[PDB]
């Protein structure tokens, strides 16, 4: 399969330049401005349009049962929707239960991903519990199955979260092998005093979600986990930020040279909690995720100024659709609502409209939030995260000036709410380009089930681990 | 014992005005310009002098095993030490061990107390463990022997250190019986693995204090107690703060409205960490405490901002000495060396010199941070901490044109070595006053052990608690 | 006239107590529990009441003519309704024009206000241009006319103004004759062409008081002329204080250690912007002052946190009120409508419902931003801002239950709106007594005009300069 | 000339990978990891080394004369003394009198530079007062003299300080025509009297310095000047940025999402003011420039680290030296000591050292804050500040592996003093390519006068432009 796309602007991360770009064999072969091709490829006209390296979206959930629900999208479904929406990566979840194997939870997610991916992914292990055991299995997963990066919580007391004394252990252990340390920072003990004392109090909706865990919870947690951080001289990486507190603190480290990265969600970046307190209980449920979307009216801007300015530098769906049936086991107790929101399809319009067309960052950082700086993390740039020779030919052909009413009604993705209902986005994948072949254009899909394939994340990723294995030699 | 204190200016933590003041029978009777009193008064000449308050310590560990070494001073050496420096109301700390009984520990420091001390005083109780048993007998204090402040440790794990969900019962525990809960705050996990870090790197000596726990241990720590705090809705204090790190996390909260109140010790605003690097050892060991003094030199100026600011409200000494003999126990481990410093005699003054003299604060902020505030907050305000009509006579003669040099030559406190050695002191207590008798003046201390009394302390304390009512009614 | 106020609880902002209080002669001679007095005295029901201090509303703006209206109120009015929302003490502002003498100007409102003032008062005079015959009027007034307050401005370009090489000479003056200096902060230069600006893009309405100044020209401002203060070493004062930005400067200031103090108004510390979009338009122009209410719904509960934790140390109404038809000078064009609102009545019992009933601060924090802290700045303290013996009798017998409703049709002050309209009040004055009578009670006002007296204010408040005076030996 | 650069790794700032390159008539032609080439090529050993964009020096004053003395350095000696260092361009300053042409200022520098530049140069025209002769002036650089960028000082009242309402002009109209603006942000007139009132205090000697103009006042201008420019929006950047307050002042700002880049030098960013204090005054002299190294201990290792995090974008030399003759100009008086320091053969070295050595910020992060922030800011990215095909062929091969000790004694640029001396630096230039030729190799500089060209510089350079035009929009 051979791709001409044809009379477009090149957008990186660093800069946009008009360029023809030449795909053979799964790779970009060429970029320039006049082409010396063999005949015969299939042509793309790019007039007008950004070529833009495909969206990778560090946070899903596809298949994952959490929370006694088992998520709408399977692998299949949801890179489909992550295709149709302009990203070419996927990065999933492991979460074994505490007191089980990391191993056999990566070997089950393998299993149910490896036939049914249609674009490439990698997967981040959960470290849910803490023993010896677990940390040979960490030195595992590094050394053989291509992991680099594992999700950790400071919340979820009884279920997943971590104490001091075990994250102390786990930073130290993730930093000698190299591995990336992505935390869920909100104070496990508070949640759970706080979701029982709301109850007592009556409130039993879905506002209970805002009001159970304030943003005090966040800030706390997250200022503590980059202490322990710092003094194991692990990477941190904080996930699904969602305050002006928690960012403010994240911003005080990184001043002080603490070794510090974030991600936000697309939802986090862009609506406020004032969706709990909607009339109709369903609408509120398919809000709830956690940390909460806050009330706080300038939180969204907040974020998105964030991202902009790089205090956070990725943005993730963190996909994890519910039905409204599944949803609704809370809606007599708001701590029963299963946290979890749609975005995979979502995320590459909804951040090209509030954060480009708002004037918040210009398209170049557009491409370093949804892809590159990801690419960096994962170990992966510039094979993804950017269009030049000899890069993986995952490419999203990109309409600045199209824009679609975002419906739920229209979309791939899993869920029965989509958080951006009518919107109106000024931004389009026309079309989808994955592993060198067209995935998407003219509005239709077509990708055999299982074409997709795991990518392993070599350790010690340089944009983190180059300063740090400096620092170390004093 | 009627005493007429003749010629000075009074200065209490609002204004300063001339007047004389005239007591009888423990209590002052009159402030004013031209007092008509019966004959035969003993006469204090107070002209050029500040009639003050008595200070009020709030951190003294007078009698106290810590460390496996016990404080050189008694309750009578240590209260006949803060009486000659100025201060007339102690309060001690009783300590009980982890699974063992607060009202034994209490009853045993009141058999040690009662009999020695040379003037007022009162006991804060350390939790130390938490059961329903605990629970009780905090109950039991409050209730019936007159306490009203607890001290909680975040630091030294498997001897004092209450975790996270133990610190959330143990505040709702204390707001429910309207006890003021004083928490040390230093990340005690990491405090734990930085000591065995740095001995591991072969830092054995007194700098290991610093090295093993840097000021974000005390931030971290110091955040996370205010949000449980917050969430439990209980006025929080936090003591022996150290750094910048901290402070700013305290006057953030205090920006956003939290009920949070904060001590920190003579040392920590005056001295820097530099003296843990001094070549002879037994000096560095003589400034080992917990949190440490920070090397940043901006670190007591920026405190001593605080304390004016009203971002820290009241200073202790901290007091518990240790000779150079007890502190050489950790010789070849800084771990082993115990914690704590001379500085009940010192407090007044130092604070004088570097706060007043040093244009940081003025005569009353003075006042405020060394005795009033501390009334207010243990609920004896306006009986102690001013000087009116009724109030305790607790009275220092206070001249702000003294020739003092410190020395521990010339100190009645105990310890080897003095922290201000060689410090010039323009403000000293002439004459102490304490229960309405003079106890110290021409340089002669002079009362008899056992002449304070225990002042019974009462819950729900008006300068913290009356706001607080009204406050959970929006919450 | 002999007045035994009893049963109530005495609360000043140190604490409170139940007291009986006597005054005679226009002083307060006894507060105590079983008070001995001749007979025959107006016996005032106090049980269940709190007895305050009255309320020094530090700016206010009778009979002043601005943006070509003339203030409804005159001091008569004003005063009044002062009294009997429970303030006992006016500071007015004189303004002089440019290029005109200051000391004409105070003489004139002296003139105004002499034979008609219900209450006790002072003047703070304007500096609005620099030149020689300025500085030797600014000493003039100090020396013998009793002002030791000046109030400048940092915006009103070519109406009030200075720059920034006048505002230090004019700071130099003021600390040299032991002044305080007054500043409104919002960056004039901004402010003149944000308004044309706003105006080009054809927004006319109220709401152009907000989208022309935004919040970061109050901010800038306000940390300019900090630091200027803090180079000519004269402390500086803020007023008006409207925003989250300029008070994170203010206190990021204080945590410095430099001298500054800060007021907000009563509708900045409970109000939104929100009010500038009303439909009516005349609701909306009733709103309008400088620096606007800001929008951010967070801002008036911050400022309110501020005023509690003491970044903020003061309260004051601004009154300024003007009619809908002035007011409507601007109906097309938002730079005309003249800046005031109506604020003298309201500012206690508003302040007490939104900080004291909504669990922000305890009712001695509501005595020192409403009364005590005004008394120390203007050197008048404990002459006012206390319940003592020997201090002026300006008390209130404030009501915690009361069941008032505020609405403009039943208030005395001027203006056709009141910023509170519907607010349900807890806390009102029953009795206001001013000078030793009852000015109001029963909810009748009585007193003469002329009865209140010019209270000249002493150079060099302790409360300010006697800290400056050792701070200054070391820079 | 063409020229193989063979075994080393290209170090770009966005990442490092092991290439050879290729140059041909001053452009680089290829890189990759074997390269097809005719024979014949100059071969230059980079194995161990690292091939760097050659570093961009954003402010010199070569020829300058300044407080009435005259910078020893003239554009021949500044731009080999650049290259000597690893400095491939150089800006340098226009600065005309109050009340003067700025056209005539640039026309006598471009006059003195031409003939006699060994490198790539363009220039910053000062705006030292204001009127509608100067607006229409700004309007003929930018159109038809190759300038983008201004520079303006809110310091040297009576000399070239801009009052408040002219600074909103010069924004207002440098935003209008797509120019960067340049500001030096400290209180003029609190700078006036605070020398005045330090010398009637008889502070005379060099610290005076300090003493005169704190840090406060520094903090005040920056956050007055960041104000003006989002009021106008303009763009607007921070030079000699040298304390912790100012700092702060930058990052607060940028959190908020105004249009805010910043500059500090190699001094402020390795140095402290206890120099002010050397008991040889002409030691002290030489360290004396404004805003002045601050006696805060902490300062130059908190600058460091905002540089390795993006709150400031771009380090530079601002090389202005003078002899040890012309310093005593201020033996009695320390106000007339004139403002500047030598550094433009140091800064490369130093910030390898202090930065990448110390572990504050990787080798890549080096690059941009040397090379590729500057090229991005002036609008020749990736001509310059990169290595890739196509490029300009200014390139460094620079060894990390060498130390060299700073010595006056062995130095090429001028001065009697090097602020350095005695400093072990780790990494050297080993060899210098300009505009595809070999400058500097063995020890030995060789390259005519003149060789060297003046750049053009377009306006609107996109990485601050394409954000602000969007914003505009509404």
Same mark, same amino acid.
């Given at each position: #399969?051979? /791709?001409?796309?044809?009379?477009?602007?090149?957008?990186?991360?660093?800069?946009?330049?008009?360029?023809? $770009?030449? /795909?053979?064999?799964?790779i970009?072969?060429?970029?320039?401005?006049?082409?010396?091709?063999?005949?015969?490829? +299939?042509?793309?006209?790019?007039?007008?349009k950004? &070529? /833009?390296?495909?969206? /990778?979206?560090?946070?899903?959930?596809?298949?994952?049962?959490?929370?006694?629900?088992?998520?709408?999208?399977?692998?299949?479904?949801?890179?489909?929707?992550?295709?149709?929406?302009?990203?070419?990566?996927?990065?999933?979840? #492991?979460?074994?239960?505490?007191?089980?194997?990391?191993?056999?939870?990566?070997?089950?997610?393998?299993?149910?991903?490896?036939?049914?991916?249609?674009?490439?992914?990698?997967?981040?292990?959960?470290?849910?519990?803490?023993?010896?055991?677990?940390?040979?299995?960490?030195?595992?997963?590094?050394?053989e199955?291509?992991?680099?990066?594992?999700?950790?919580?400071?919340?979820?007391?009884?279920?997943?979260?971590?104490?001091?004394?075990?994250?102390?252990?786990?930073?130290?252990?993730?930093?000698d092998?190299?591995?990336?340390?992505? $935390?869920?920072?909100?104070?496990?003990?508070? =949640?759970?005093?706080?979701?029982?004392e709301?109850?007592?109090?009556?409130?039993? %909706?879905?506002?209970?979600?805002?009001?159970?865990?304030?943003?005090?919870?966040?800030?706390?947690?997250?200022?503590?986990?980059?202490?322990?951080?710092?003094?194991?001289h692990?990477?941190?990486? !904080?996930?699904?930020?969602?305050?002006?507190?928690?960012?403010?603190?994240?911003?005080?480290?990184?001043?002080?040279?603490?070794?510090?990265?974030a991600?936000?969600?697309?939802?986090?970046?862009? !609506?406020?909690?004032?969706?709990?307190?909607?009339?109709?209980?369903?609408?509120?449920?398919?809000?709830?995720? &956690?940390?909460?979307?806050?009330? @706080?009216?300038?939180?969204?801007?907040?974020?998105? *100024?964030?991202?902009?300015?790089?205090?956070?530098?990725?943005?993730?769906?963190?996909?994890?659709?519910?039905?409204?049936?599944?949803?609704?086991?809370?809606?007599?107790?708001?701590? +029963?609502?299963?946290?979890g929101? *749609? %975005? #995979?399809?979502?995320?590459?319009?909804?951040?090209?409209?509030?954060?480009?067309?708002?004037?918040?960052?210009?398209?170049?950082?557009?491409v370093?939030?949804?892809?590159?700086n990801?690419? +960096?993390?994962?170990?992966?740039?510039?094979?993804?995260?950017?269009?030049?020779?000899?890069?993986?030919? @995952?490419? =999203?052909?990109?309409?600045?000036?199209?824009?679609?009413?975002?419906?739920?009604?229209?979309?791939?993705?899993?869920?029965?709410?989509?958080l951006?209902?009518?919107?109106?986005?000024? %931004? =389009?994948?026309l079309?989808?380009?994955?592993?060198?072949?067209?995935?998407?254009?003219?509005? =239709?899909?077509?990708?055999?089930?299982?074409?997709?394939?795991?990518?392993?994340?070599?350790?010690?990723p340089?944009?983190?681990?180059?300063?740090?294995?400096?620092?170390?030699?004093?």
């Amino acid at each position: #399969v051979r /791709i001409l796309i044809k009379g477009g602007k090149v957008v990186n991360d660093d800069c946009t330049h008009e360029a023809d $770009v030449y /795909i053979e064999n799964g790779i970009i072969q060429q970029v320039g401005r006049e082409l010396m091709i063999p005949g015969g490829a +299939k042509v793309i006209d790019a007039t007008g349009k950004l &070529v /833009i390296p495909g969206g /990778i979206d560090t946070s899903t959930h596809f298949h994952q049962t959490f929370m006694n629900a088992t998520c709408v999208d399977d692998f299949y479904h949801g890179t489909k929707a992550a295709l149709v929406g302009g990203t070419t990566m996927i990065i999933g979840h #492991v979460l074994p239960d505490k007191e089980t194997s990391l191993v056999d939870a990566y070997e089950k997610c393998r299993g149910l991903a490896d036939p049914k991916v249609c674009c490439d992914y990698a997967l981040h292990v959960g470290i849910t519990w803490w023993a010896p055991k677990v940390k040979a299995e960490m030195e595992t997963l590094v050394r053989e199955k291509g992991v680099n990066s594992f999700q950790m919580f400071m919340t979820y007391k009884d279920l997943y979260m971590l104490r001091d004394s075990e994250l102390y252990q786990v930073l130290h252990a993730c930093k000698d092998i190299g591995a990336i340390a992505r $935390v869920h920072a909100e104070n496990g003990e508070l =949640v759970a005093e706080g979701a029982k004392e709301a109850l007592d109090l009556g409130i039993t %909706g879905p506002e209970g979600i805002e009001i159970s865990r304030p943003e005090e919870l966040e800030a706390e947690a997250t200022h503590r986990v980059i202490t322990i951080a710092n003094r194991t001289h692990c990477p941190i990486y !904080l996930v699904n930020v969602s305050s002006i507190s928690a960012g403010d603190v994240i911003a005080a480290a990184k001043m002080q040279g603490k070794v510090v990265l974030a991600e936000t969600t697309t939802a986090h970046a862009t !609506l406020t909690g004032l969706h709990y307190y909607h009339q109709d209980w369903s609408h509120a449920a398919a809000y709830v995720t &956690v940390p909460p979307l806050r009330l @706080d009216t300038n939180t969204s801007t907040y974020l998105m *100024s964030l991202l902009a300015n790089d205090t956070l530098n990725i943005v993730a769906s963190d996909h994890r659709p519910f039905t409204t049936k599944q949803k609704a086991m809370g809606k007599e107790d708001f701590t +029963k609502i299963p946290h979890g929101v *749609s %975005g #995979v399809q979502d995320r590459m319009s909804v951040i090209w409209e509030r954060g480009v067309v708002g004037g918040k960052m210009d398209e170049n950082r557009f491409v370093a939030v949804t892809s590159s700086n990801a690419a +960096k993390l994962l170990n992966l740039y510039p094979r993804k995260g950017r269009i030049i020779p000899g890069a993986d030919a @995952d490419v =999203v052909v990109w309409d600045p000036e199209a824009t679609k009413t975002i419906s739920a009604s229209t979309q791939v993705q899993g869920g029965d709410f989509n958080l951006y209902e009518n919107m109106r986005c000024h %931004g =389009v994948p026309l079309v989808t380009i994955s592993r060198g072949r067209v995935v998407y254009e003219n509005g =239709v899909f077509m990708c055999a089930e299982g074409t997709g394939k795991f990518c392993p994340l070599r350790s010690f990723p340089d944009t983190v681990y180059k300063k740090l294995v400096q620092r170390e030699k004093t």
